[PDB]
Amino acid sequence: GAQVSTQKTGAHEIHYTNVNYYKDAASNSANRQDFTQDPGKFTEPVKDIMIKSMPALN
Amino acid sequence: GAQVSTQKTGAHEIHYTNVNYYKDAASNSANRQDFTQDPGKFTEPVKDIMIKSMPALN
Amino acid sequence: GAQVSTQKTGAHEIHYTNVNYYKDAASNSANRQDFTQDPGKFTEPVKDIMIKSMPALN
Amino acid sequence: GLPTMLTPGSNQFLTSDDFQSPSAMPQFDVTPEMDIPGQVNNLMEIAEVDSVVPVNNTEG
Amino acid sequence: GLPTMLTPGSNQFLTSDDFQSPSAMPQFDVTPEMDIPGQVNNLMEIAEVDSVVPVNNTEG
Amino acid sequence: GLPTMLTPGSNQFLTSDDFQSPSAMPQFDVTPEMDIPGQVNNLMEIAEVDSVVPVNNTEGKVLSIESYQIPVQSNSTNGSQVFGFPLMPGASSVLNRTLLGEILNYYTHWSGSIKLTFMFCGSAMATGKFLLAYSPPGAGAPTTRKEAMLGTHVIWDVGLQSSCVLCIPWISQTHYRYVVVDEYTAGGYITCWYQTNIVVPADTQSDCKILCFVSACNDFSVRMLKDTPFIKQDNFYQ
Amino acid sequence: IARVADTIGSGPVNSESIPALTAAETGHTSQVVPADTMQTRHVKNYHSRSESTVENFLCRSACVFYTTYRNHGTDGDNFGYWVISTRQVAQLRRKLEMFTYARFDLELTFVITSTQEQSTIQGQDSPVLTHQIMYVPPGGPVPTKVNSYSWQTSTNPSVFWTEGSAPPRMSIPFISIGNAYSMFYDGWAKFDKQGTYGINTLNNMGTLYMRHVNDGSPGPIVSTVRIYFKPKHVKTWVPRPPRLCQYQKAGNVNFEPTGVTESRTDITTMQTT
Amino acid sequence: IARVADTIGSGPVNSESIPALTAAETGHTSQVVPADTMQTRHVKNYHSRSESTVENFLCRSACVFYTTYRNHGTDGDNFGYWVISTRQVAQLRRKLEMFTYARFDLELTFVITSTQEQSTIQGQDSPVLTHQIMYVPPGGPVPTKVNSYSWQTSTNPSVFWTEGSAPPRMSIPFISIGNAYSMFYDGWAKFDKQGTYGINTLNNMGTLYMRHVNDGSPGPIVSTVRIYFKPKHVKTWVPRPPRLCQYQKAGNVNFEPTGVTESRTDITTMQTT
Amino acid sequence: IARVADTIGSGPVNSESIPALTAAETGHTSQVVPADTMQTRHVKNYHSRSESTVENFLCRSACVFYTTYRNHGTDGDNFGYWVISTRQVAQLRRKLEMFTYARFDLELTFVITSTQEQSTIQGQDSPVLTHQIMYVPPGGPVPTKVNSYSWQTSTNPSVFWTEGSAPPRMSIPFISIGNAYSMFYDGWAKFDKQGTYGINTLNNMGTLYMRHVNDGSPGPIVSTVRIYFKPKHVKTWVPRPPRLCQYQKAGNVNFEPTGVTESRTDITTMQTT
Amino acid sequence: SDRVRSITLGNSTITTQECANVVVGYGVWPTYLNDDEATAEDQPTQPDVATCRFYTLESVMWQQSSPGWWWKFPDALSNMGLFGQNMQYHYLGRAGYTVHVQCNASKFHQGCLLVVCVPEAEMGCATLANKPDQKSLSNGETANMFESQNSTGQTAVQANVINAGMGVGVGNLTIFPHQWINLRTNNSATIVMPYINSVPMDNMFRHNNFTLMIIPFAPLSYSTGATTYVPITVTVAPMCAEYNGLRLAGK
Ligand SMILES: CCCCCCCCCCCCCCCC(=O)O
Ligand SMILES: CCCCCCCCCCCCCCCC(=O)O
Ligand SMILES: CCCCCCCCCCCCCCCC(=O)O
Ligand SMILES: CCCCCCCCCCCCCC(=O)O
Ligand SMILES: CCCCCCCCCCCCCC(=O)O
Ligand SMILES: CCCCCCCCCCCCCC(=O)O
DSSP: OOOOOHHHHHHHHOEEEOOSSSSGGGSSOOOOOOOOTHHHHOOOOOOOOOOOOSOOOO | EEEEEEEEEOOOEEEEEOOOOSSSSSGOOOOOOTOOOTHHHOOOSSSSSOOOOSSSOO | EEEEEOOOOSSSOOEEEEESSBEEEEEOOOOOTOOOOOOOHOOOOOSSSSSSSSSSSO | EEOOOOOOTTTOTTTTOOOOOBBTTTTOOOOOOOOOOOOEOOOOOOSSSOOOOOOTOOOO | OOOOEEEEETTTTOOOOOOOOOOTTTTTTOOOOOOOOOOSSSSHHHTTSOOOOOOTOOOO | OEEEOOOTTOOOTTTTOOOOOOOTTTOOOOOOOOOSSSSEBTHHHTSSSOOOOOOTOOTTTGGSSTOOOOOOOOSSSSSSSSEEEESEEEEETTTTSHHHHHHHHEEEEEOOOOOEEEEEESSSBBBBBBEEEOOOOSOOOOSSSHTTSSSEEEEEEEEOOOOOEEEEEESSSSSSSSSSSSSSTTOOEEEEEESOOBOOOOOOOOOOOEEEEEEEEETEEEEEEESSSOOOOSSSOO | OOOOOOOBOOOOOOOOOOSOOOOOOSOOOOOOOOSSSSOOOOOOOOOBBBTTTTHHHHSSEEEEEEEEESSSOOOSSOOOEEEOOOOOOOOHHHTTTEEEEEEEEEEEEEEEEEESSSSSOOOOOOOOOOOEEEEOTTTTTOOSSTTGGGOOOOHHHHHEEETTTTOEEEOOOOOSSSSSSESOOBSSTTTTTTTOSGGGGGGOEEEEEEESSSSOOOEEEEEEEEEEOEEEEEEEEOOOOOOOHHHHHSSOOOOOOEEEEEEEETTOOOOOO | OOOOOOBBOOOOSSSSSSSSSEEEEGGGOOOOOOGSSSSSSOOOOOOOOOBBBBBHOSSOOOEEEEEEEEEEEEEOOOOOOEEEEOOHHHHHHHHHHEEEEEEEEEEEEEEEEEEEEEEOOOOOOOOOOOEEEEEEEEEEEOOSSSTTTGGGGGGOEEEEEESSSSEEEEEEEEEOOSSSSSSOOOOSTTTOSSOOBBBGOOOOOEEEEEEEEOOSSSEEEEEEEEEEEEEEEHHEEEEEEEEEEOOSSSSOOOOOOOOOOOOSSTTTTOOOO | BBBBBBBBBBBOOOSOOSOOOOOOOGGOOOOOOOSSOOEEEEEEOOOOOOTHHHHHHHHHHHEEEEEEEESSSSEEEEEEEEOOOSSSSEEEHHHHHTEEEEEEEEEEEEEEEEEOSSSSOOOOOOOOEEEEEEETTTTTTTOEEEEEGGGSSSOOEEEEEEESSSEEEEEEOOOSSEEEEEEEOOOSSTTSSOOBBGGGGOOOOOEEEEEEOOOOSSSSSEEEEEEOOEEEEEEEEEEOOOSSSSOOOSSSOOOOOOOOHHHHHSSOOOOOO | SOOOOOETTOOOOOOOESOOOEEEEEEEOOOOOTTOOOOOOOOBBBBOSSSSSSSOOOOEETTTTOOOEEETTTTTTTTSSHHHHHHHEEEEEEEEEEEEEEEOOOOSOOOEEEEEEEETTTOOBBBBBSSSOOHHHHHBBBBBOBBSSSSOOOOBOOOTTTTTTBBGGGGGGGGGGEEEEEETOOOEEEEOOOOSSSSSSBBBSOOOOEEEEEEEEEEOOOOOSSSOOOEEEEEEEEEEEEEEEEEEEOO
């Protein structure tokens, strides 16, 4: 049970291996590459869709 | 994910193994065997081909 | 790239494993079991075959 | 045992390292996760929100 | 990291050990080997050669 | 845990080791690479470029541009020498400060053939023939043109093509040589003589200049990195 | 990949669409890009947001407290204790308090250093020191002396450490009784609203105890233990404005009123700063 | 394989082809081999250029600075700092400056050594020392005392190290805002051209801070930290002539004019040297 | 398998074949086995020659030199150096000199030990010592002081070592410019035959430099470094008779004439010995 | 033959009957910045004819004791037509250059000039503590002269030609794209320089970042009665010039 993942490399011109040693999931290392984004919660929390090009208010 | 490469040995009369441990590509070891050569940039930067046996200037 | 070889054991009534870690062939361990023998260079350097049972000189 | 060689950086505490360590509380059963509103995964989701600018930040 | 236990013989210098060590000159390109006459692979090839015996090794 | 035994070399700092270490800045996103002109992958691509040689590095000339200028003039005798220096690209002061020699001083061993280009920077009405000779070691340095033509040489005829190349072939008993001066790895002697005279018409300058360039051939190579004796320091630059 | 958006090419416009005009009263933050109010070129942006994730922003070891204990004591009374909290330091407290709720595992690290004290007890030749950090969860028996029975640690987790070696480290899971750690609490502890008000109501994490396992030598010695927290496997909820005023207490959010920003000369001075 | 070219066999020649004659005015470097001006034999050359690659030429640990800090101080004011640069040493500066642009990762190593000072504080028996190197990027809060709050290192990367163990080492990626590190800059910092001129314009790497994590003991002690840089994963652009004159300053390329080479007696003396 | 030959069975003989008679003038060494001059039985010999290979005979760590350097010095001038050679010790020199040519890689190991010196500088409490061995190949800049710029080791390979840990070790490849290391050289360095004659002509290996990286403490200290060579991956050519006379110099093979063996009473005395 | 050559850029043309060849940078012809290399988002300006054309600088006079000259670019073109105009109104810029140095003689004249383009040619001051002032580094359209002796001055540049103002060996300058004007061989030298920098675009007023040096390695020489006025004219043309960041004019 070894996990081969992709290292953090540069763009515009590379794997590491991981084995878990302990029985608890808290003993693992950090989730350094959990890239998720949902900004709509805070920037567009309104009920109606509010298209950009249209006027906000009639 | 283990990489078996050829060691540096002598010519005229031999592998090592590599595993990456860290998540960043900068944590890796040096590229000791990146043998590339393009001397034409500095020694023949002229526009025309300039064949050797021919006279350089007419 | 692991090499499984036969250990040195006794005769008349047993493997070890080897992995290379470094990029240079000089970093390896010694060739403790390179058993080759050619004594004829020093003990029979003569031009003619010189069979044993025959007289050396006529 | 397995022959090993210690390399530079052994026994050092680098505050930004990713290693595994033993749990002081083995087999602990954490509370079940709950769906809370307003989860943040990136700090750029906070910078992308409007905030008032004190342009008239004069002395008084 | 990987949990490991140190065993007796650690940090000892035994003059007849077979280990791998780092090269102080990385990527050095050695001279090409040459076919020299008289290569010796075993010391028993030297003992199997005749040599004169000083049988008359008296005092003078 | 896994039983392990520590071996010699543990906790040692060898300045030429290849190991992996943790990044103090995890997940850092480097700037995107750009296509810049003039990428260098090998230092031998720099040594293979021509560079002017200060052949006239005499006591007063060395602090001036006249170090590079090799004086040639019209003579009344025959067979005179123009210059001469030893084939020591790493140790000779005639060569160790060029692009080729500056790179050699970072290394302990060299090998391969050398090129010596000569540009005739005189008038267009001037004419001359020159004997560019190389002599391997074992006998002394040649002292006359009769002794230089026994060795490796090229007779240079000046004309529309202003330059000429004397290729110093690799003739040694070892595969490499020492950058430092050593009697076991002597290199030989480079000499230039007059194969004829500098013949010039009236109202022209009899005195001319010649330029020397030195660059490595495609079989040139270096070995055993070291520090240079060229740069020094007494205390930290503030 | 937390890769940012590419810039799209845009030419001249003349139409009824009004991307620049909006109503900020709606609470909606406008999604205008530069390609809406000017002719842009095409840019393939390779920049990534990998470093502003909440895991990377928070996964840094930070010192949260240090205390001192001696070897001689009286009588004694030469040991250390810390009631665990994340609010006694300014730096880590402000990062954790950018959110209202957080769930994470911890990486706990200790840095123990010993100092020789002024005295006339020459000559001193003291063997290596060994320290014992004991964690007592809420309700367990507390050490009263430096040699009391509680140090047996039959069920209480303890780490023993000898000086000169790597600093000790262990992982702690998410241990709260709630579904998330609270950085902020806007209620009281008692139902009648008397008593403690605020985040101190939920602070029941426990206590750490430190001592020398060695018997005290003639030469006086004082040791200081630095605790370092590192959040791991993070999940944050409800971000809030960063703390502007300087902290005063650990139990509450009491502050001294502070200006909104640094002032400048006038409304048009470009010397900012 | 960075294998050099084999030598080809060549016999006598008599023709119109003129490989030895050329025009050096063109800027083209002639590609003449020895097989063009003499009868050569065939040589299978097995020599390789593996050691002159820019990675191997540059991938050597080099000391770039060392500074000292004490344990007593006043008041104090017993800590060290270094504004990071690669131009305070002659040896590594000349290697990096053979190119105009370089991109690489670094391997950073420290060698910390402590020395006992002259005093009459007998007798001294001091426990092992622990050092803390903190890196403060540009703009972050600076340590003002040896015990100030900035040493908490909530977000600033720091390495803790106890004496007697392996020298600490960590990797740094390529961190510049440009697409390449500049060894040379031929402009000013301000648009009006007043102010700093040259490579100092682009020096904004940060600062390192060092201290003893231990409290000071009675016996005086001074520690020196040696920083070592090792370029990794190198890419170089636009090689330039090696520095001939001895360096004078770190911020600029100011020099004292030097002769082209070592002089000799005359144009024909073979005693060189 | 380096297994020796089995003994074949042989009965009585009466014939013209003469295996025991030969001509030693031919230079041929007779290949007579015991089965040619007596009735032998059959013996399955399981003895092997695995221990007399040139690799096993030579692959033993051997001390080749040790030198001392101090911490105080003047002024200073407290550092060590060794011009590398294999001919300053008797034991390893005689093994290597059983052959005329050898090609091998080396395993280099150091054993550094420090000693306290007589003084009245009480009291002394000195932190752990760190040593730096620098290797300067031929032509490189030499250290002139214990703190000169050459110790930066920008390109020169150096190993840093703290006391109390495993002795440092590194591998060196085969580095000669010839196709083999020469143990013996029967020529001069200059073509006119003036100057150095013999194996010293080819000795251009380099020099090692040692120092304390620590600043000197009040208490005097002297350290000694022992260098150990271990041939690896060996290839030997042209064996020659072992050295009979005791060595005198390192550069040459000069000797004092010695008897062929130990003498005995007469030609028939069995008391040998 | 290969000695003749013509170069047409914009409404300008240069003919040469006695040249050597064209040296093209590091083998790279100048091009426009691509979408995957760009970082500035606004649509760039490309005049493409009014700016990418030939401009002739101020001529110098080769004398028997002239150590050499140097120009900084694009500071030399900062007042040349519409190329200088776009530089003033824009924050960012980008160009490559065709450089044509021209010096003719009488076939009885002798002397060899080194013509080289040095990228990022940072120059040292004559006083080690100070920095060279703005005018000593680049006089714009006028050449700054090398000296054949040590320079003096608080803000002066160390213009001793043996180190070329940079602290290097002047004979080692052939590592950069260079050419030679040898009076017996050719009367001109031309180099095509691509845009070289650590960023895709830069400010054209606070950065150069290449210098043009003209150093006589063989001095000018002639017999009495020959023409003694031998000038060297420099004609540069920006190639593929584009601009970003329009605003009010300056500097
Ligand atoms: C032997 C060492 C064991 C120590 C175990 C320590 C466990 C204590 C819990 C630490 C987590 C506290 C986090 C609270 C967060 C908050 O209040 O905002
Ligand atoms: C705890 C240790 C962390 C230290 C991190 C140090 C990062 C500083 C950046 C080093 C690279 C500087 C290279 C500049 C090259 C140049 O200017 O030519
Ligand atoms: C930091 C340590 C590096 C030291 C590198 C030492 C390399 C020196 C060469 C050793 C081999 C010499 C063998 C010569 C054999 C002979 O002369 O017979
Ligand atoms: C961090 C790099 C770890 C390298 C691997 C060392 C640990 C042992 C790996 C054993 C792999 C087989 C186990 C499995 O089946 O998953
Ligand atoms: C430098 C030599 C490293 C030797 C290997 C030790 C590390 C563990 C190897 C585990 C191999 C399986 C992982 C994988 O699938 O790639
Ligand atoms: C000396 C015994 C070494 C034991 C093995 C430890 C090193 C890691 C082995 C990894 C094996 C997989 C690598 C490979 O594919 O060759």
